[PDB]
Amino acid sequence: RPDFCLEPPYTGPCKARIIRYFYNAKAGLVQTFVYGGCRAKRNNFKSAEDAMRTCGGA
């Protein structure tokens, strides 16, 4: 499982309101967060299926 899946979600500095998904390894579920638009970290997906495919693995 990529280690970036353990990171908290990161809004970043921009001011857009974009809903993105991240994998919550504590909750063991994909959740949503508000992404401001720039400087994304790796735990940031455009759909829940992308997050689960990437972070739900072994």
Side-chain angles (χ1 to χ4, degrees), residues 35-58:
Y35 177 45
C38 67
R39 321 310 221 222
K41 280 196 175 178
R42 285 176 292 178
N43 198 6
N44 171 337
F45 308 87
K46 269 172 285 243
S47 66
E49 322 20 87
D50 282 342
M52 186 62 169
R53 195 180 81 253
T54 305
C55 294

